[PDB]
Design a protein around this ligand. Structure first.
Ligand SMILES: OC[C@H]1O[C@H](O[C@H]2[C@H](O)[C@@H](O)[C@@](O)(O[C@H]3[C@H](O)[C@@H](O)[C@@H](O[C@H]4[C@H](O)[C@@H](O)[C@@H](O)O[C@@H]4CO)O[C@@H]3CO)O[C@@H]2CO)[C@H](O)[C@@H](O)[C@@H]1O
Ligand SMILES: OC[C@H]1O[C@H](O[C@H]2[C@H](O)[C@@H](O)[C@H](O)O[C@@H]2CO)[C@H](O)[C@@H](O)[C@@H]1O
Ligand SMILES: OC[C@H]1O[C@H](O[C@H]2[C@H](O)[C@@H](O)[C@H](O)O[C@@H]2CO)[C@H](O)[C@@H](O)[C@@H]1O
Ligand SMILES: [Ca+2]
Length: 516
């Protein structure tokens, strides 16, 4: 892995349940057998969307957690674990969606203004999830839902390994900037979603709070606004993305725009910990979307991410740290393209995100954005998961591997692995002052023969005059590896004579000793 490290010892593989209720896909008894099959293939737990639309459909405080309890019961019967997602967003309308569960229709009647939903640059209304600006409504509703959910599920604490929160559309903390109705679906630029009167008012008040008066606003932005009502979000999204973002106005607008998501993150994290820490005491997390298109568009740099709300990932992740929420990035199986017209750089995106997360000490989890039908995508996921310190990987989705033994087997081999500590010892290494020693191998867990950025470092043992390292390896998987030497300048000086192997890596911690 990067930084002379290896795979994360806490790595776990997860399986996404279907979007629709289990009975609409199969039966509970078969489902229990599926779970056992999943566990046998290296899956630690099943993640599942519990839709707000299903749990509080009829009206405020009219809960129904029976499906969830029933699901949990079967999970318990299979001797499995589960990760509930309190899906406060609509199922249907997003990529891969095979469902139709809008959030409770009554919620939209909690306000007479337009504070609850989103409106795009062109007026497209979106009601997939509550507008995070309506923090008062969010605090109440989410607080009540989380609290009631905790009580109803308390007797199933034993099978709940983690709890996920939904920070926006598709269960991700972002704005609904890429949708078919708004004409912003991949791979087009996204449209900003701050055009409801309420959003314009909030931005206006935020700006005036920051500078005090319009006169000071005009001084800071170098503008000549005639009235406070002239303080508005971008009137021309395209022009803003081309050059407007560079101005002090642009920086302020984006700070506010992303800031809303950061505050929302802190709010839901607070509400979740209050409702769950005592009852379950398990990690809590939220998701960030991989908006990889328009990444390197020369004309509109990161033209899809900024409208989605992603302007500064470092700053965004800090909010997750403050809220004590683990992060899941949802797009690891893709390769960089960076070519017209999509300007897609998903791999670069994931690496940057993973790097920030690791630096900040944020538990990082990953998912594949689209269904995987080939082993190559699994290898791409593995390269990212095992070289960028991911603590977990969740496969979308259930059916793809449950009904494809071939694919299921590839997954077990490459991603359904159990990490195990092992000591690697290499003797008679002809190193000189300044040299460092590393090992690299065939599997992703070993850096896939990369010597530049993914090798695993070994350390000299002056007591035994050899080089050693405690490495995390995939249990019961065959491996091939070789130690090699890097000079002070970082140049690879030489390699170990014979290629080593472990067929397979022992389940119990031990050591592998070989000579250079
Ligand atoms: O069961 C959990 C949730 O499952 C669904 O949400 C998934 C979604 O299906 C999945 O695609 C994803 O990854 O999120 C991002 C993704 O990271 C982005 O890349 C992008 O997807 C685009 C593709 O990358 C691109 O190649 C092309 O296909 O266009 C895609 C969409 O424009 O956008 C999505 C955001 O939706 O993760 C989520 C979260 O698990 C389901 O929708 C959701 O309701 C469930 O909660
Ligand atoms: O709120 C002030 C004005 O903001 C926008 O205008 C921005 C524009 O979005 C940006 O691309 C450019 O670089 O700067 C101007 C401000 O000088 C709105 O479009 C205007 O209607 C607002 O008055
Ligand atoms: O680059 C992929 C191959 O890496 C190694 O091959 C090394 C070899 O170990 C070393 O002794 C020699 O000097 O250089 C080659 C090429 O870098 C693995 O041993 C191979 O299995 C990989 O395919
Ligand atoms: Ca309520």
């Amino acid at each position: 892995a990067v930084n002379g490290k290896g795979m994360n010892p806490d790595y776990k593989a997860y399986l996404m349940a279907p979007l629709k209720k289990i009975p609409e896909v199969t039966n509970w008894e078969t489902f229990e057998n599926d779970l056992r099959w999943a566990k046998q293939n290296g899956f630690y737990a099943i993640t599942v969307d519990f839709w707000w639309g299903d749990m509080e459909k009829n009206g405020d405080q009219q809960f129904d957690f029976s499906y969830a309890q029933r699901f949990a019961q079967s999970v318990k019967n299979a001797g499995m674990k589960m990760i509930p997602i309190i899906s406060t967003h609509q199922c249907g309308g997003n990529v891969g969606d095979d469902c139709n569960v809008p959030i409770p229709s009554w919620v939209w009647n909690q306000k007479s203004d337009d504070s609850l939903y989103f409106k795009s640059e062109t007026g497209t209304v979106n009601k997939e999830t509550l507008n995070p600006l309506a923090s008062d409504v969010i605090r109440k509703e989410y607080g009540e839902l989380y609290t009631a959910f905790a009580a109803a599920m308390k007797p199933y604490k034993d099978v709940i390994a983690k709890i996920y929160l939904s920070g926006g559309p598709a269960g991700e903390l972002r704005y609904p900037s890429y949708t078919t109705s708004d004409g912003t679906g991949y791979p087009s630029r996204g449209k900003f979603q701050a055009y409801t009167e309420f959003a314009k008012s909030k931005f206006r008040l935020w700006v005036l709070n920051k500078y005090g008066s319009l006169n000071e606003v005009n001084k800071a932005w170098g503008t000549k606004l005639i009235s406070e009502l002239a303080i508005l979000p971008p009137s021309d999204g395209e022009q803003f993305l081309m050059n407007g973002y560079l101005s002090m106005y642009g920086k302020d607008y984006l700070e506010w725009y992303q800031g809303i998501l950061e505050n929302h993150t802190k709010l839901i994290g607070e509400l979740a910990h209050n409702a769950f820490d005592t009852t379950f005491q398990v990690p809590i997390g939220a998701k960030i979307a991989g908006v990889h298109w328009q990444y390197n568009n020369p004309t509109i740099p990161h033209g899809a991410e900024k409208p989605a709300g992603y302007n500064d990932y470092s700053h965004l992740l800090d909010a997750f740290k403050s809220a004590k929420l683990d992060v899941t990035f949802t797009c690891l199986e893709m390769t960089d393209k960076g070519s017209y017209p999509e300007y897609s750089m998903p791999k670069t995106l994931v690496q940057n995100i993973a790097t920030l997360a690791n630096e900040k000490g944020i538990v990082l989890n990953g998912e594949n954005a689209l269904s995987i039908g080939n082993e190559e995508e699994y290898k791409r996921v593995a390269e990212m998961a095992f070289n960028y310190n991911f603590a977990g990987f969740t496969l979308l989705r259930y059916q793809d591997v449950m009904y494809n033994n071939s694919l299921m087997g590839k997954f077990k081999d490459l991603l359904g692995v159990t990490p195990v500590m092992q000591t690697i010892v290499v003797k008679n290494v002809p190193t000189t002052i300044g040299d460092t020693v590393y090992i690299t191998g065939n599997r992703a867990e070993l850096g896939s023969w990369d010597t530049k950025q993914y090798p695993i470092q070994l350390y000299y043992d002056s007591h035994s005059n050899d080089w050693r390292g405690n490495v995390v390896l995939p249990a019961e998987r065959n491996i091939e590896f070789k130690a090699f030497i890097k000079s002070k300048d970082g140049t690879v000086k030489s390699w170990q004579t014979i290629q080593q192997s472990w067929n397979p890596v022992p389940l119990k911690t031990t050591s592998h000793t070989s000579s250079w």
